[PDB]
Symmetry: C4
Subunit: 352 residues, 4 copies
Amino acid sequence: LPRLICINDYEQHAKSVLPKSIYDYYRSGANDEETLADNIAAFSRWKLYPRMLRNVAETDLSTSVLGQRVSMPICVGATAMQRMAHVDGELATVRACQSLGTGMMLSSWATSSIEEVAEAGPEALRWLQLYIYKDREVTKKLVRQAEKMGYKAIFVTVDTPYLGNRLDDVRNRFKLPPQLRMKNFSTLSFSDSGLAAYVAKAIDPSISWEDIKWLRRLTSLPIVAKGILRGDDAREAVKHGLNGILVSNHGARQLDGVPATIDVLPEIVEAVEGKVEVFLDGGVRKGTDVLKALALGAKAVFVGRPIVWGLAFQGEKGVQDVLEILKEEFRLAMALSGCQNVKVIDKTLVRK
Amino acid sequence: LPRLICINDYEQHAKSVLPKSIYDYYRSGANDEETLADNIAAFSRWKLYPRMLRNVAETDLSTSVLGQRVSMPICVGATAMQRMAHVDGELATVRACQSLGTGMMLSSWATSSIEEVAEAGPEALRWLQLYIYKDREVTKKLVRQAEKMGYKAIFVTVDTPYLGNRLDDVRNRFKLPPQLRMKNFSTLSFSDSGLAAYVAKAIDPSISWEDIKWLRRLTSLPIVAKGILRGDDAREAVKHGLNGILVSNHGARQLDGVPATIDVLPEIVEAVEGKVEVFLDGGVRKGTDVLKALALGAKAVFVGRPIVWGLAFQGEKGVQDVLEILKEEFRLAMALSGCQNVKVIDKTLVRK
Amino acid sequence: LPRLICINDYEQHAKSVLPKSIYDYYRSGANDEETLADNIAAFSRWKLYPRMLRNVAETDLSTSVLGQRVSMPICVGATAMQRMAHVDGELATVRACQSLGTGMMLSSWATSSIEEVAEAGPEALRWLQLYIYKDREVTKKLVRQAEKMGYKAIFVTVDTPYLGNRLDDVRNRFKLPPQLRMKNFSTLSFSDSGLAAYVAKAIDPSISWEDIKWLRRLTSLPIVAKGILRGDDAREAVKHGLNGILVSNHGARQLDGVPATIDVLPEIVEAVEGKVEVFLDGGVRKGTDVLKALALGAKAVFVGRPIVWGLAFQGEKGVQDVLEILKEEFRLAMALSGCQNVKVIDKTLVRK
Amino acid sequence: LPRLICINDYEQHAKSVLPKSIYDYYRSGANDEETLADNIAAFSRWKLYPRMLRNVAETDLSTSVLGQRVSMPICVGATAMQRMAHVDGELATVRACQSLGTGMMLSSWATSSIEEVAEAGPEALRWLQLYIYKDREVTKKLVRQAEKMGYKAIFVTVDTPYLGNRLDDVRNRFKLPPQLRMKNFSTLSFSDSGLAAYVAKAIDPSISWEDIKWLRRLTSLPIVAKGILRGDDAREAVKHGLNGILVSNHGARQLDGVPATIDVLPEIVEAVEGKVEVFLDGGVRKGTDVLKALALGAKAVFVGRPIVWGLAFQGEKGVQDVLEILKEEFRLAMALSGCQNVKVIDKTLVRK
Ligand SMILES: Cc1cc2nc3c(=O)[nH]c(=O)nc-3n(C[C@H](O)[C@H](O)[C@H](O)COP(=O)(O)O)c2cc1C
Ligand SMILES: Cc1cc2nc3c(=O)[nH]c(=O)nc-3n(C[C@H](O)[C@H](O)[C@H](O)COP(=O)(O)O)c2cc1C
Ligand SMILES: Cc1cc2nc3c(=O)[nH]c(=O)nc-3n(C[C@H](O)[C@H](O)[C@H](O)COP(=O)(O)O)c2cc1C
Ligand SMILES: Cc1cc2nc3c(=O)[nH]c(=O)nc-3n(C[C@H](O)[C@H](O)[C@H](O)COP(=O)(O)O)c2cc1C
Ligand SMILES: CNC(=O)c1n[nH]c2ccc(Br)cc12
Ligand SMILES: CNC(=O)c1n[nH]c2ccc(Br)cc12
Ligand SMILES: CNC(=O)c1n[nH]c2ccc(Br)cc12
Ligand SMILES: CNC(=O)c1n[nH]c2ccc(Br)cc12
């Protein structure tokens, strides 16, 4: 009988139940997976310096993301094609987010439509993750749908001019199961790695800061740059009028040998000088990871793979369980470190 | 036939004879057990710079803890529920301490009573480890019993507003064997982890420095703060009139990802400026560990798990054997490093 | 059915098909193979700081080596006796280089003649790797043949006064398969390790900077010093009128315990002050390795073992496949790091 | 058929042929064997920066130890009870040393007599390793015998007031095979670890610098302090008129957790300011180890365990083979690093 009490248990259970090609697609990093290992190892190098005797009977995990209240600084990151993991895919995910009172970043290519997800999760805090397609009419349609269907921000992914080289996907000749489809667009629906070639056909490798200007003019919605790893690029994003930075290495699935996100976070927080919120994804598996990211000045963190593992175990209930595990680990890490609320999580809590 | 000649052998023997759930309870750290590994690895990073030709024919291991003479700077730390390991539990432990001429820190929740332990070990140096219960009358009763029964200090544990998340205990659904009871208090006797929920019900998560003031007013007994890991908290403990700091991460069982105790010891010794004795626990398994802790300015060290392993092997005789092993390793480490007595163990003996 | 999608797969396939003594000869480093491991591990320590939104739709990999255009900054290094790996040996290699539009460094002892290789690869960019033989007439003949047959530079190997001690070759009592011969010279044709004793008989251990002066006077061809690991030696090579430095530890096959080539590259680039091109070999297995070497100021890199593994798999087609794998990994690493061409690969892309 | 081409092969062969208790006695370090691992690992951290084109056709390995010429800076260290490894024990060893033209340090407790060893090796360079026995008449007799029988120095061991705690020896209840005896003295002949208790009975733990003064007055022979790990002690040895320092941690068999000898060597070389020769033992297994020790300012190195492994394989011939392996590795390391002789091995050859 499954007894899954931490994120790692969910991954182990997912490996046991998913087809190998699908588990490999979800698990993989790029090339030799150096950054994949480092996203996790880096968190272990940051040590915690807990304060005692601070009164933690009433721990308040609540915060805000881009002015929208959330129950905890732990939000769902964009993961493509969620119906591969569970028949309810993105609808299971958004229902879990609504229950938890946190936000869902929806992949511009999901196996579910912008409208279907807003319908399933009307009261959920919802954001759209955008790629800049070679087809700018496709791209504008996605932004307009997001605006009309009550999405609260655009996360524009800037680290994927081309897909990374995930060796298992190349070996398995990965493609979507037959009955599934990217449901916001034939060849654009994703009817070697089939995904790499799909991207080579649909995603624009020419995107530049000029296209960020276009997007900033297209929508008044808050825009976050997702995939920044350098302070100079972070400063450029602020200069282009963007409203946030998601420090991300794409789950270590793009360029291998980039630093862990927790290691580059302080340089990015320093570079933006408090002008915009900074977020982190990559390697978040435990409450202490959330605490270290907030101590180093992230407003909130996003989780990618853990959500897929929850779906694989039991759809909406499995996503809810994963998010509740992270919530309760984060509560306990705050309490044991002497933090009553997120506003008193300070830089002195951590040292590398 | 058991031939146990070092602490690690006692652990291996304990694993072979204890029920898995009990061995797991004793062995575990919190979450991924990063700090548990580091408590041991950290000692190996501190290298010894021995002096030669100093005349070590007459090595004197004796010292004092809070003005009470002990035979060696190696004392028994508080470990709950010792009758799980051996039918004689805390009584076996205190008899061994009396034989060795060292001190026993008694867990405020032992499977034996403050009076039963003072009766078994009348000539033993004995201290009480205190939790601040939500029930302050319970808490005062424990302090008064400790005073009446000849205990020489209070170690107030400050790092446990809630219990840490020990995964094995959650998986094993840990609880005390049926015939046992915390014998100083029904639900307060400890009739997921049952221990985590017990603490959530009995231990006060609201404790603050104000409660330390209350305790300092309640008793004239020496009070040591157990669980401090930051210099600022150590300085606060001194300002509250406390008489010692036990640098402890609770055997790595509370917040995971805190530093090893041997690594934070020098910051704490520096912070208290010689106003109070500083002690260390966490990872002590060898005579050289004791030597490194004293070289970095600890007065004495406490051992937790090694004592449980001694009880598991042969009750009082097994505790005595464990303490004699540590005594003789510590004698040999002093002799080979050129130290005739504890007063000449200096900071130049170690370098990280 | 072989499905070889990265350099490591080619090595694994080579181990499966080559006689053990031949695979061991190709794989080995010197002594305990510390530098062999480090040539690879060192690349992983250099982290990439990619720029986003730079427009990488049109990536241009082309560069030049000593004024000769190449398709990519990835060239074939000298590896002796290539007919052990495949019946077509050096002819397979040069044909693959001609197809790719990159250069081949031909081993002065190949199982194929300077003329045979120029005949097979007339349009290929070709250089000769030279040892200074005790027989200077032999040595001059090789240089003159290289000049007459359209070779564009001399790489003089300076780190092999004697052969390194490769333990497997000593254990296997290594020697060339019977039908093969070093085809540019009986005992000089290579008719414990037979190779070590061959070198002890043919290669001059007395070579000094005076012999570099002799070589500089012998030919007007560009000369590169191969095997430099110190800045002072690099500065000496420039003072002797040489035209390049190949930072090399001989694939970790000579002196064990020297640093990784990627770690010494920056000291050498600094020492030559832009007077000559600096190249690197040792441990190049991935596109990101090429990118890190160019970010640290190498003009191009050479690959040794990967080429042998390509030959072992399928001769010319296997060499072509290996070079195309490296080309495409390097294209993707440039694109994901925001580099449109090799001239914009800058030092800020990397940090150790 | 044994094919032993490096020191490690000799150890592997010794494990295969010796009784477990004897192999364990020879192999062991103290306690958890942290320093034992580090004596070897430390050498790997020191990297070599070889010079090229220096003319190494004529490599001269010769040097001098305390004014006596040797063939190579590689000498035999004192290892007790050599007849356990081979019936010819110390006589096999001294004959091998005479053949090689290097020196033998004879253990004051050997299974062979000071006279027997001088008889077997009349032309060998021979030194006596001395313990200060509680019996000073025993101690004086050994020194006088050494003087009369043509020994050229006294190595006084200063790191063994008591024997280290070698766990395997305690578990195996180690003692000499029955027919053997320490042949320079009943209980003094060595008729838990029997060795630890023997030392507790024969070796004086009270030895101080005052006893060094006594020894300096007893003999005009050169005296080297063996077991120094601190610069202050090295400076004290010079002030007492001693003529050398052997940087040694006793093969990591005494105090565990001391640094590797190669790591403390530079501090000791700096402390003695060129007043006396500094030597190293501990972890020497390869020619590159010898080169790194001389680059950091040791005059010569001693080998302990490798000599025992040679005896175990084939007595005198096995010792000769081990010493010839080290000689030839050291020749090759000098040649590949550009060193014609030991006088040009400089500090720029190494960097940690
Ligand atoms: C299966 C999978 C699919 C992903 N799909 C997308 C995507 O559609 N859009 C996107 O911007 N990022 C995508 N990412 C990256 C994630 O948004 C996120 O940056 C990453 O998963 C965070 O690291 P973690 O998995 O360690 O939590 C995907 C990641 C995974 C593992
Ligand atoms: C089984 C077990 C029970 C413990 N019970 C208590 C307790 O009742 N009170 C307390 O303050 N600390 C308790 N601790 C923590 C110990 O006092 C001590 O800080 C820790 O064991 C020291 O580390 P060591 O086990 O590595 O020697 C316990 C530790 C263990 C392993
Ligand atoms: C099998 C083999 C043969 C080699 N033969 C030569 C040679 O003839 N001349 C030479 O200068 N270097 C020779 N080398 C060294 C290579 O030119 C080159 O420096 C090294 O292979 C680069 O490292 P890599 O194998 O990690 O790519 C050889 C290396 C190998 C593995
Ligand atoms: C089996 C054995 C016996 C030893 N006996 C002695 C001894 O009699 N006197 C002494 O001063 N050192 C003794 N030593 C220490 C050695 O002289 C030397 O310091 C050590 O072996 C050097 O390290 P290595 O074994 O790594 O080469 C002994 C070491 C070993 C391994
Ligand atoms: C890591 N990323 C993916 O696997 C991914 N990222 N963006 C995508 C768009 C479509 C598809 Br299908 C997959 C992805
Ligand atoms: C690590 N700690 C424990 O396991 C512990 N610490 N304090 C306690 C009080 C009661 C019980 Br039961 C167990 C404990
Ligand atoms: C690593 N190097 C070799 O294995 C090598 N290097 N130069 C050579 C010349 C002839 C032969 Br055969 C082999 C080699
Ligand atoms: C490591 N050392 C030994 O094992 C050793 N060192 N000194 C000795 C004297 C007698 C005997 Br037996 C053994 C030893």
